[PDB]
PDB file of C-alpha atoms and ligand atoms in Angstrom:
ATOM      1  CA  UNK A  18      -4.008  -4.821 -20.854  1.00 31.91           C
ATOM      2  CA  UNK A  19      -4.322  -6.096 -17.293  1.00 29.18           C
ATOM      3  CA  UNK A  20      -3.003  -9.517 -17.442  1.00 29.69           C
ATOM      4  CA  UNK A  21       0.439  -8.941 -15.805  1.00 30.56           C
ATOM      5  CA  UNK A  22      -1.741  -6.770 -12.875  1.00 34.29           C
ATOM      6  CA  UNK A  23      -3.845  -9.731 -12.266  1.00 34.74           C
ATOM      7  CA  UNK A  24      -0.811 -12.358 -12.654  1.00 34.31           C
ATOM      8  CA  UNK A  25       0.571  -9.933  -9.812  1.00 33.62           C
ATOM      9  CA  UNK A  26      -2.076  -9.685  -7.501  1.00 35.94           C
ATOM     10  CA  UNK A  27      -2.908 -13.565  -7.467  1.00 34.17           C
ATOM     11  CA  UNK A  28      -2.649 -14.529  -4.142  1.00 32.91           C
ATOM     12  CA  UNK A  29      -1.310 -11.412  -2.516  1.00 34.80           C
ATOM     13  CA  UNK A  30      -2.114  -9.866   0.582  1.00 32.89           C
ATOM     14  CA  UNK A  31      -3.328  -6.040   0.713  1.00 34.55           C
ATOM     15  CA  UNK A  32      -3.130  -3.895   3.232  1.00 36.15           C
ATOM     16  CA  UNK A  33      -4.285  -0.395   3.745  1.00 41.92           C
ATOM     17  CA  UNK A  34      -2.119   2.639   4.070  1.00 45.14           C
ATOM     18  CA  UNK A  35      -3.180   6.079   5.748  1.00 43.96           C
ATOM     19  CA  UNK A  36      -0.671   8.652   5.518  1.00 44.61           C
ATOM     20  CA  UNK A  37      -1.404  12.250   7.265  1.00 44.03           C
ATOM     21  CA  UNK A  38      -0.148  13.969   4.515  1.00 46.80           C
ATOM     22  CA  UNK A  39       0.262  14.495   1.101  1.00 44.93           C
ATOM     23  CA  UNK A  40       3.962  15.021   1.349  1.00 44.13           C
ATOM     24  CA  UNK A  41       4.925  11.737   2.363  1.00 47.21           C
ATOM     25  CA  UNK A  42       3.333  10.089  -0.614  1.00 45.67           C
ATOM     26  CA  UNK A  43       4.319  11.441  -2.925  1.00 46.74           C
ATOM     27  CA  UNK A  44       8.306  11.167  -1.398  1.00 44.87           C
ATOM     28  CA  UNK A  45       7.492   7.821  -1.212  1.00 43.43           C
ATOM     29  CA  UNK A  46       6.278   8.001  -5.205  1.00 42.40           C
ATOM     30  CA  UNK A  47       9.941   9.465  -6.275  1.00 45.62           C
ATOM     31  CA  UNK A  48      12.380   7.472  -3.669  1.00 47.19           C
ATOM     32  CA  UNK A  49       9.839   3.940  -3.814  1.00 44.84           C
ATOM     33  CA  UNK A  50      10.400   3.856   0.379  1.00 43.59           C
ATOM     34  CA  UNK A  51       7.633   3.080   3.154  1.00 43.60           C
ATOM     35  CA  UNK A  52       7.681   3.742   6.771  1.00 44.61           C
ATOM     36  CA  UNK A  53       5.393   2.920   9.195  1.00 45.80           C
ATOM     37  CA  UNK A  54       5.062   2.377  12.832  1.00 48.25           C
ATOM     38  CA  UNK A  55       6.675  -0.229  14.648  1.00 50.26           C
ATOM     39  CA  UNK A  56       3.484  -2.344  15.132  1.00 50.80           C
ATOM     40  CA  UNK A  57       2.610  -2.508  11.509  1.00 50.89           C
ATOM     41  CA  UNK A  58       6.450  -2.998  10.374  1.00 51.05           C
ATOM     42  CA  UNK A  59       6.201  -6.100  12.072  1.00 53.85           C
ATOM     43  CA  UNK A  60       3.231  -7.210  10.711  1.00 53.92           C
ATOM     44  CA  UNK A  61       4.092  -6.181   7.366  1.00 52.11           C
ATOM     45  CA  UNK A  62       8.041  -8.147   7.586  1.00 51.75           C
ATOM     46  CA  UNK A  63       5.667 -11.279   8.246  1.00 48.92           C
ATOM     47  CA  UNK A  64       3.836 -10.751   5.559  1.00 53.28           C
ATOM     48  CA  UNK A  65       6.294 -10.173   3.548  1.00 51.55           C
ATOM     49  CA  UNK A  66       7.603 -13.816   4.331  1.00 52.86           C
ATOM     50  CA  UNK A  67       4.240 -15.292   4.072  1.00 56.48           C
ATOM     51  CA  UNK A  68       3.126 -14.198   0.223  1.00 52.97           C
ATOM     52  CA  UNK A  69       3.659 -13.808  -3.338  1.00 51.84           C
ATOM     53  CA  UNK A  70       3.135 -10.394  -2.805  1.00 52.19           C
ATOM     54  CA  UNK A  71       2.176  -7.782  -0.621  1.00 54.06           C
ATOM     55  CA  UNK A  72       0.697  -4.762  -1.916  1.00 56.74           C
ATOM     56  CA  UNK A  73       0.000  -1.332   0.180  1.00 58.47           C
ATOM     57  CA  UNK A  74      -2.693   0.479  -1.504  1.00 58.95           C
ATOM     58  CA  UNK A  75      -2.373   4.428  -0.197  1.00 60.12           C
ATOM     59  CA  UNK A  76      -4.727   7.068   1.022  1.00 61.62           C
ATOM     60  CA  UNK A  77      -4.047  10.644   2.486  1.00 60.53           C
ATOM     61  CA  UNK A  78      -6.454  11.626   5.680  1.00 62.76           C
ATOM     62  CA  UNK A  79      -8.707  14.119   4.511  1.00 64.28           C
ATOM     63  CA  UNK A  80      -8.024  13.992   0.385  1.00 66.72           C
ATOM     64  CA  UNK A  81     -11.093  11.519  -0.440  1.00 69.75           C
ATOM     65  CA  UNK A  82      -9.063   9.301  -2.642  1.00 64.94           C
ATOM     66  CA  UNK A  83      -6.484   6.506  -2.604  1.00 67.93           C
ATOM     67  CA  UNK A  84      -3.259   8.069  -4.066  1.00 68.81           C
ATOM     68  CA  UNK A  85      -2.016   4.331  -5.667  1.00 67.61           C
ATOM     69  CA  UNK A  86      -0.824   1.209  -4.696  1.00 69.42           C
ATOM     70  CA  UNK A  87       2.609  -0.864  -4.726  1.00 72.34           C
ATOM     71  CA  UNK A  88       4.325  -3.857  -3.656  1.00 71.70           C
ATOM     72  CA  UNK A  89       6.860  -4.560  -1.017  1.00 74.86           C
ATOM     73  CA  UNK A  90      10.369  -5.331  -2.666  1.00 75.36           C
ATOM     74  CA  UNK A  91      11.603  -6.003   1.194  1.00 77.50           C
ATOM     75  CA  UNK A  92      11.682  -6.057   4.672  1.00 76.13           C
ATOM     76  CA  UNK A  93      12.178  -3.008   6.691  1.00 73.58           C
ATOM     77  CA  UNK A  94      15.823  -1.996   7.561  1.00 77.34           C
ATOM     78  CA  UNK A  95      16.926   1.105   9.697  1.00 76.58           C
ATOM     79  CA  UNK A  96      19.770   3.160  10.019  1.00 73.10           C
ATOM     80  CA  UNK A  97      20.462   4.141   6.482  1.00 71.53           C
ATOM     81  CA  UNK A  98      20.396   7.894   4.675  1.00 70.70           C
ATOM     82  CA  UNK A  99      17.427   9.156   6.588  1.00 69.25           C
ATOM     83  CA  UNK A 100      14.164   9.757   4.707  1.00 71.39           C
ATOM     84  CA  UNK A 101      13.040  13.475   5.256  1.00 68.82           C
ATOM     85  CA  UNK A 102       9.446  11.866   6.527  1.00 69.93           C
ATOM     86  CA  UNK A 103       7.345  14.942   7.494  1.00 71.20           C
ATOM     87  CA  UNK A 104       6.754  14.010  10.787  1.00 73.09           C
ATOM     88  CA  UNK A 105       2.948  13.552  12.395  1.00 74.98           C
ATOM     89  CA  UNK A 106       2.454  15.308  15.822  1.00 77.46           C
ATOM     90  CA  UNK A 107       3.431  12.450  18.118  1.00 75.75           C
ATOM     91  CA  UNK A 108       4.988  10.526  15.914  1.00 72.17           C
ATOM     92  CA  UNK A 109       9.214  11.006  15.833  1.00 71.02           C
ATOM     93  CA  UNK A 110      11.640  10.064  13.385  1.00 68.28           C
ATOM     94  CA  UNK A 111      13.181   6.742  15.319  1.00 66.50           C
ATOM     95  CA  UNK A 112       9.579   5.734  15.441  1.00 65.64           C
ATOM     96  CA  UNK A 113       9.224   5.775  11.503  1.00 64.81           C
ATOM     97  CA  UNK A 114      12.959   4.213  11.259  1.00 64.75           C
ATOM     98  CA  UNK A 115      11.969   1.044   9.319  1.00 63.73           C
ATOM     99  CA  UNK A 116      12.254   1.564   5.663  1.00 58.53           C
ATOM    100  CA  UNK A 117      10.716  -0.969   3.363  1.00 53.51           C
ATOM    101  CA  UNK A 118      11.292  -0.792  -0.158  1.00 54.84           C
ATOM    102  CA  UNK A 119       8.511  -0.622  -2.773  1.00 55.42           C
ATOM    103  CA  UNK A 120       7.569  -0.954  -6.456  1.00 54.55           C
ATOM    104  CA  UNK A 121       4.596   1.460  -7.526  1.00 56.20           C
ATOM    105  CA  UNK A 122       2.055  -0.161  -9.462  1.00 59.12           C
ATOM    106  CA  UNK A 123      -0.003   2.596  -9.908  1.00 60.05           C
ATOM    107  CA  UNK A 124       0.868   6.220  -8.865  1.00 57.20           C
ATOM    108  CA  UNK A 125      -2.686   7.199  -9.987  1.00 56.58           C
ATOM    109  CA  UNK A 126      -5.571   8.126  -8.081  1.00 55.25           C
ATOM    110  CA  UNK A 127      -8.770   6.682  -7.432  1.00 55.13           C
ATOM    111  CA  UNK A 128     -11.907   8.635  -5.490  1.00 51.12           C
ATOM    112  CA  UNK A 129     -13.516   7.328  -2.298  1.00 49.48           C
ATOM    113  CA  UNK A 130     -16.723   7.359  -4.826  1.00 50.98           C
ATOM    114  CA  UNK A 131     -15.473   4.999  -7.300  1.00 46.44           C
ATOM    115  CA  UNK A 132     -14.960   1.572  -4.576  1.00 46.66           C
ATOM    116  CA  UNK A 133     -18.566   2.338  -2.527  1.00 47.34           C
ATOM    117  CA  UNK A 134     -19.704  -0.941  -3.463  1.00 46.34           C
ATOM    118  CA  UNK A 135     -16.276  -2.417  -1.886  1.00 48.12           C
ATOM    119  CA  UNK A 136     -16.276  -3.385   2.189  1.00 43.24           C
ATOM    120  CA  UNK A 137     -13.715  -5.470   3.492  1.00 39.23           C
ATOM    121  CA  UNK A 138     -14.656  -8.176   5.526  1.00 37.63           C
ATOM    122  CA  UNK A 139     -11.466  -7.867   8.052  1.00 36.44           C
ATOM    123  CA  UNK A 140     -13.013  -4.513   9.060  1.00 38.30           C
ATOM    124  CA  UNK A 141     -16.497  -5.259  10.171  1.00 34.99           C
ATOM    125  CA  UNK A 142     -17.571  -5.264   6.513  1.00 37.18           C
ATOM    126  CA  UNK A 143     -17.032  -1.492   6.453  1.00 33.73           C
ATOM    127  CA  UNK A 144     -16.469   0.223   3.306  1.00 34.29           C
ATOM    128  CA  UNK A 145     -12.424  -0.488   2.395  1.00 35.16           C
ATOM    129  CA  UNK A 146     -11.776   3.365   2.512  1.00 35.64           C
ATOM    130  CA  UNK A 147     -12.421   3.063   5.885  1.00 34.40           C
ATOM    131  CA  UNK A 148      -9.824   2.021   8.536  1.00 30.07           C
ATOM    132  CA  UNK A 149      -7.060   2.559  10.171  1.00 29.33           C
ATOM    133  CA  UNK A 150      -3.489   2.260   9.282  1.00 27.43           C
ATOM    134  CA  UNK A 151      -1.793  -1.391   8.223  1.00 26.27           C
ATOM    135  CA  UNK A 152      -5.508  -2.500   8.552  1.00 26.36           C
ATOM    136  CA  UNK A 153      -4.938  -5.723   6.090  1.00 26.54           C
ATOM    137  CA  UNK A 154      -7.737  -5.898   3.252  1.00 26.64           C
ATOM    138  CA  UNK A 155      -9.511  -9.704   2.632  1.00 30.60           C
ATOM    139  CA  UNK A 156      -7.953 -11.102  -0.873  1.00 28.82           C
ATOM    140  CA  UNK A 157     -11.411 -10.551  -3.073  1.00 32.36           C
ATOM    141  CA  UNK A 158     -11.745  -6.984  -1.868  1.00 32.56           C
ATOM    142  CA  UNK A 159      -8.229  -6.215  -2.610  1.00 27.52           C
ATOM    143  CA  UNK A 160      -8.160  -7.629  -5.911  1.00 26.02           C
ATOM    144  CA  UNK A 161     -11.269  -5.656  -6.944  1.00 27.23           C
ATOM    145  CA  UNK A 162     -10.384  -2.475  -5.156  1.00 28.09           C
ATOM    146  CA  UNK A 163      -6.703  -2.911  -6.982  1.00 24.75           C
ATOM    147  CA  UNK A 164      -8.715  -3.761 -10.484  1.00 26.66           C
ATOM    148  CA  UNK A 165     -10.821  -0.284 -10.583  1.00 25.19           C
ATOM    149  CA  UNK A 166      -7.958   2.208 -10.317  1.00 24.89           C
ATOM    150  CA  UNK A 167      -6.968   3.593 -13.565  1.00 25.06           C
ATOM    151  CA  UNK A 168      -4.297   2.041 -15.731  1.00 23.38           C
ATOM    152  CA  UNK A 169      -1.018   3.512 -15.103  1.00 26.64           C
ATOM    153  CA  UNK A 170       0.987   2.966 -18.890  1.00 29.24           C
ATOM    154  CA  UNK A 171       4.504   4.167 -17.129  1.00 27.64           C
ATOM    155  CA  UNK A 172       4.191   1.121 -15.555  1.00 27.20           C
ATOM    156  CA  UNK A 173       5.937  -2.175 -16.884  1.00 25.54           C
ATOM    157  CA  UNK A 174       5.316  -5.318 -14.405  1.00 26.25           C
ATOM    158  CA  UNK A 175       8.058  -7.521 -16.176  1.00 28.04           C
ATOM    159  CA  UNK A 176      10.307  -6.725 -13.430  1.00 26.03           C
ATOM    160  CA  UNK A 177       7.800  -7.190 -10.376  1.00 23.47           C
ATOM    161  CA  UNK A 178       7.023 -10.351 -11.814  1.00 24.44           C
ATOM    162  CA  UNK A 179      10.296 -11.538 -11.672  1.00 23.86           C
ATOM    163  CA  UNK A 180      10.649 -10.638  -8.120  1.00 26.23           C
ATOM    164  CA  UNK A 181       7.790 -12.980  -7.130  1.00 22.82           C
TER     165      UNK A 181
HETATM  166  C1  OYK B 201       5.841   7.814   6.219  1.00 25.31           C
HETATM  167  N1  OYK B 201       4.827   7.215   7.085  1.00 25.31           N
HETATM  168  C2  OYK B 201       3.681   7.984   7.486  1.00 25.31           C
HETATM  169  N2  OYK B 201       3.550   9.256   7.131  1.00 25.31           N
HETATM  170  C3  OYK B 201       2.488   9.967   7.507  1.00 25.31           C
HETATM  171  N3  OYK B 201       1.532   9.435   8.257  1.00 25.31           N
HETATM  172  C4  OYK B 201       1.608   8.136   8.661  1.00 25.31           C
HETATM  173  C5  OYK B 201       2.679   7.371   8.289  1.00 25.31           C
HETATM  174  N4  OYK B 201       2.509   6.143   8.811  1.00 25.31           N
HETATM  175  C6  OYK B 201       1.360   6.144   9.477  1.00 25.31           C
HETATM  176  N5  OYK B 201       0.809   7.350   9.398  1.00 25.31           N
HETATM  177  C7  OYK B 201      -0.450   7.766   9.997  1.00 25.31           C
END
């Protein structure tokens, strides 16, 4: 079923995740870690304050697809057991420094194809696969972009629902 999902994503806030490689995905998939850079950390920590939940939903440049989508379980915090992050040209380690924790909830993927007839009205009304890093998705389009991915059955929300 998809009552728990829904019960999850009422009232979140979504925002959009573009990772330059596959590599850091799917670390972020085993270790459930995010980091991004400093002007989206802070946006996500006051989001994270402001919400029943905040979801990232995931997509690697260049792959065509979103990779999944979780839920911040924190606010970022730096300094711990560094997270071998393979690093962007231009971008260092310090500068990806803020770890926020996460709980998948769905590691599958879904094509560019499949959400065509999704645009989010935060960017310009363009189609939600397009936009740039931390760009924060309206609640509607979230929800239904969220809704087509495929069911992941490793998945139990009892947990993430007593987080909220
Ligand atoms: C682990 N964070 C990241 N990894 C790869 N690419 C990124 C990241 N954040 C923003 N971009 C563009």
């Amino acid at each position: 079923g998809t009552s728990k999902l829904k019960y999850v994503l009422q009232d979140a806030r979504f925002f959009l995740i573009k990772s330059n490689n596959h590599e850091n995905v799917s670390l972020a998939k085993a270790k459930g870690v995010w980091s991004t850079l400093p002007v989206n950390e802070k946006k996500l920590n006051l989001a994270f304050r402001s919400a029943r939940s905040v979801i990232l939903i995931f997509s690697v440049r260049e792959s065509g697809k979103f990779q999944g989508f979780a839920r911040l379980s924190s606010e970022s915090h730096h300094g711990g057991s560094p997270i071998h992050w393979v690093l962007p040209a231009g971008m260092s380690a310090k500068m990806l420094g803020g770890v926020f924790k996460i709980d998948w909830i769905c590691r599958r993927e879904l094509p560019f194809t499949k959400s065509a007839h999704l645009t989010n009205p935060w960017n310009e009304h363009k189609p939600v696969k397009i936009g740039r890093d931390g760009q924060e998705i309206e609640l509607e389009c979230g929800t239904q972009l969220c809704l087509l991915f495929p069911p992941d059955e490793s998945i139990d929300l009892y947990q993430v629902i007593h987080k909220m």
